[PDB]
Amino acid sequence: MNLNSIPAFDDNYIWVLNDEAGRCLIVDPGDAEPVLNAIAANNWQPEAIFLTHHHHDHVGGVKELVEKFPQIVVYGPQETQDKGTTQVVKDGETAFVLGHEFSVIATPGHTLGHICYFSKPYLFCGDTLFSGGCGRLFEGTASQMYQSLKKLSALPDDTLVCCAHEYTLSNMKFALSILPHDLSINDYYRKVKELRAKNQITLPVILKNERQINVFLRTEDIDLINVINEETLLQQPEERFAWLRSKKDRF
């Protein structure tokens, strides 16, 4: 398969995988217009849409896409049944698309019903995991997001993190506000700053690298533990997650 990105709105990406014949899988199409344009420009043959969660910026384009291409199957969680899903998927299920079996992983936190899709190496993790960050907890608890990120981080090292928003630079500025001396975070911040200064996409990222630069994946890293403890004594990695997530909310 071949990966493509379609920008939408201010900072969304609509990921598309295509096979050699041009059949395609479209992930979280919040705006149909750039998707329809890309389908036509590339002569793609739409097969499926994957939805990760119910927010407008991920689902708004479904109706128009399926009107133009009624053959599309729309896979999504129960919380998207009223957003155009025609095949519900749940934790531990799979969807067979473009000749590949995608695993479905429930990741409550950003929304309660958020799911991620994985077919090695591609991880479509929506708004759960971002490069350098994680989703805001609009519906779920910090415990849920902590457990969700633990599952995603346990995927293979070569996983390509295909998240939905170009938030990487802001995420790294937050990281430096917590760990200003951390060399890996500083180096990745500079790389990202330069990509964005040239208007270049920062995604996808390799999970092995991501774990080293993402404070939300580092709650057992002694360096982060120690810096947090200079302000608030915390012994549980899950507590460090909630402390970080609340700090980021205010940043």
Q: Does 231 count as an annotated binding residue?
A: no
C-beta of 138 vs 251, nearer to Zn ion: 138
Helix (H) or strand (E) holding 2: strand 2-8
Size of the site for Cl ion (CB under 5 A): 3
Match 């759960």 to its residue by tokens.
128
Residues 41 to 80: which contact Zn ion by CB under 5 A?
55, 57
Q: Does 216 count as an annotated binding residue?
A: no
C-beta of 12 vs 240, nearer to Zn ion: 12
* Residue 35 tokens, joined: 């998707």
The answer to whether the CB of 42 falls within 8 A of the CB of 35 is no
Pick what 248 binds: Zn ion, Cl ion, none; C-beta below 5 to 8 Å, kind-dependent: none
Site mask, Cl ion, residues 124-143, x = CB under 5 A?
Answer: ---x-------xx-------
Size of the site for Zn ion (CB under 5 A): 3
Residue 15 is which amino acid? W
| 251 forms part of the interface with Cl ion (CB under 5 A) | no
d(CA 133, CA 120): 22
C-beta of 11 vs 223, nearer to Cl ion: 11
d(CA 45, CA 59): 20
Q: Tell me the window of 1-9, 20-28, 123-131, 181-189 that interacts with Cl ion (CB under 5 A).
A: 123-131
Strand runs (DSSP E) across 45-179, as ranges? Answer: 45-50, 73-76, 87-88, 94-97, 100-106, 115-119, 122-126, 129-130, 133-134, 160-163
* Residue 245 tokens, joined: 């997530």
Site mask, Zn ion, residues 111-150, x = CB under 5 A?
Answer: ----------------x-----------------------
Pick what 140 binds: Zn ion, Cl ion, none; C-beta below 5 to 8 Å, kind-dependent: none
Site mask, Cl ion, residues 80-119, x = CB under 5 A?
Answer: ----------------------------------------
Among the listed residues 120, 126, 173, the one whose alpha carbon sits nearest the alpha carbon of residue 149: 126
Residues 147 to 206: which contact Zn ion by CB under 5 A?
none
Q: Does 110 count as an annotated binding residue?
A: yes
Residue 82 is which amino acid? D
d(CA 131, CA 47): 28
- 3 state SS of 137: coil
Which residues sit at the interface with Cl ion, rule CB under 5 A?
127, 135-136
Residues annotated as binding site for Zn(2+)? 53, 55, 57-58, 110, 127, 165
